[PDB]
Write a protein that binds this ligand. Structure first.
Ligand SMILES: C[C@]12CCC(=O)C=C1CC[C@@H]1[C@@H]2[C@@H](O)C[C@@]2(C)[C@H]1CC[C@]2(O)C(=O)CO
Lengths: 339, 34
C-alpha cells in the first residue's frame, strides 16, 4: 500500500518481465509479480548476511532507504489489504510453509511467518514425495479455486521445506462485452501469419486512452468493478520489442498520467486463456540472487544453523479473458533442502 | 470514430488502485499458443 513497497515491487515486475522475454522471446508471458515478490520476501525472513542482502536487493529495495524490518511490515500490510472482504471482486492471497516434521525451526521464525506473512506451518512427509507433492498442489488448488493444479511437478524426496504463495483473482468488467458481438477474426502473429480467435467487441465506449507516438504504441485502461483495472498496451506492428525495452516504473507512471478519456467507436479484444509455467532459478540468478542456491547459503534465520539451501523456485500462472470479466491465478513455490 | 483493435501482440497489466500492486503481467503473442 505504501509508496516504497509499490516502487520496489513495480521495478521488480518489469525486471522479471524483461528476463522472461529474453529467455523465451517467442512465447506468451503470464506471471504474478506480487506473488513472486511475496514468496521471496517470505524466504528472506529466514535469510542472513549476503543471502539476505541479495534477495532484498534482487526484489529492488533500496537498502540505504529501508530496512528488512520495514520491508516485512510492508508485506504484512499488503496481505491484510489484499485479503479484505469485498462484494465486488474476488481477490485472495495466501502463504504457507510445508516442513519436514523433524526439522527444528526457530520459534521466532515460525511466529514471524504467521504474524507477517499469514503463513501456517504444515508438517509434511517429504520422503513420501508423491503424498507431499499432492498436499502442496491441493493447497494451491484450493487457494486458486482449481485454476492452478500442478504447481509442484517434481519434489526431491530429501526436501526439507517448501514455501508457497498463491494469488486468486476474479473480476467483472465495469463495461462487459456482449457475447453476441464476439466473432471469429484474425489475430496476426506477424505481418503475414495469423490465427483465428473469438474477437470480443464493445461499441461506443468512453475510456482512458493515450497514443504514445514516441514509443509507437496505444495504451488504454479498462476497468473492473472494484479496485482493480488493467492497462492494455498495443504496440504497432513489429514494435513489441521496442515497447518492451521501455517498460519500467517510470514509463508506466507516465502512461497513467497521460491517459485522457476518449470515445472509442469499436474496441476489439480476443477472448483467450493462456498459461505459463516457470523455473525461476536462472532468472533470479540474473537478478543477483545467488548465494541462497549455493553451499554458501545462509538461511540460519529459519533453523539457527546454516543447514538449508534453496534448490528451486517455480511459478505458474493462468489468465482467462472473456466477455463478463477476467479470472487469473498464480502461485510460487520455494523448495529448500538440507545443506 | 477511433478504433482500438487488439489483433496483434499486446501487453496486459492488471493493477490494484489501492496498493499499486501489479497483480498480473502478460504478453499475448498468440492467444492459441501451445
Ligand atoms: C506507476 C505507479 C507509480 C509509482 C509506483 O511506485 C508504482 C506504480 C504502479 C501502479 C501505478 C502507479 C501510478 O502511476 C498510478 C497508477 C497508474 C498505478 C496503477 C493504477 C493507477 O493508480 C492509475 O491508473 C491512476 O488512476
Amino acid at each position: 500500500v505504501d509508496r516504497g513497497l509499490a516502487s520496489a515491487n513495480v521495478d521488480f515486475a518489469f525486471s522479471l518481465y524483461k528476463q522472461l522475454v529474453l529467455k523465451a522471446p517467442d512465447k506468451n508471458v503470464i506471471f504474478s509479480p506480487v506473488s513472486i515478490s511475496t514468496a521471496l520476501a517470505f524466504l528472506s525472513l529466514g535469510a542472513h548476511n549476503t543471502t539476505l542482502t541479495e534477495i532484498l536487493k534482487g526484489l529492488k529495495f533500496n537498502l540505504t532507504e529501508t530496512s528488512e524490518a520495514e520491508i516485512h511490515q510492508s508485506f504484512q500490510h499488503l496481505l491484510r489489504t489484499l485479503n479484505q472482504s469485498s462484494d465486488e471482486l474476488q481477490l485472495s492471497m495466501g502463504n504457507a510453509m510445508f516442513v519436514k516434521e523433524q526439522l527444528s525451526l526457530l520459534d521466532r521464525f515460525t511466529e514471524d511467518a504467521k504474524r507477517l506473512y499469514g503463513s501456517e506451518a504444515f508438517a509434511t512427509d517429504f520422503q513420501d514425495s508423491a503424498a507431499a507433492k499432492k498436499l502442496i498442489n491441493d493447497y494451491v488448488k484450493n487457494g486458486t479455486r482449481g485454476k492452478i493444479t500442478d504447481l509442484i511437478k517434481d519434489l526431491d524426496s530429501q526436501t526439507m521445506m517448501v514455501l508457497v504463495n498463491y494469488i486468486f483473482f476474479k473480476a467483472k468488467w465495469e463495461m462487459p462485452f456482449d457475447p453476441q458481438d464476439t466473432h471469429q477474426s484474425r489475430f496476426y502473429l506477424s505481418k503475414k501469419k495469423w490465427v483465428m480467435v473469438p474477437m470480443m467487441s464493445l461499441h461506443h465506449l468512453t475510456i482512458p486512452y493515450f497514443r504514445d507516438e514516441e514509443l509507437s504504441c496505444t495504451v488504454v485502461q479498462l476497468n473492473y468493478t472494484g479496485n482493480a483495472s488493467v492497462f492494455f498496451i498495443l504496440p504497432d506492428q513489429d514494435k513489441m520489442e521496442e515497447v518492451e525495452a521501455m517498460l519500467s516504473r517510470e514509463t508506466l507512471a507516465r502512461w497513467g498520467d497521460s491517459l485522457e478519456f476518449r470515445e472509442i467507436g469499436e474496441l476489439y479484444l480476443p477472448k483467450f486463456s493462456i498459461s505459463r509455467d516457470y523455473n525461476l532459478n536462472d532468472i533470479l540468478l540474473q537478478l543477483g540472487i545467488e548465494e541462497a542456491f549455493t553451499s554458501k547459503a545462509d538461511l540460519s534465520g529459519i533453523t539457527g544453523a546454516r543447514n538449508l539451501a534453496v534448490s528451486q523456485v517455480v511459478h505458474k500462472a493462468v489468465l482467462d479473458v472473456f466477455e463478463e470479466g477476467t479470472e487469473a491465478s498464480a502461485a510460487t513455490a520455494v523448495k529448500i533442502t538440507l545443506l | 470514430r477511433t478504433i482500438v483493435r487488439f489483433n496483434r501482440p499486446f501487453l496486459m497489466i492488471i493493477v490494484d488502485h489501492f496498493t499499486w500492486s501489479i497483480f498480473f503481467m502478460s504478453k499475448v503473442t498468440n492467444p492459441k499458443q501451445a
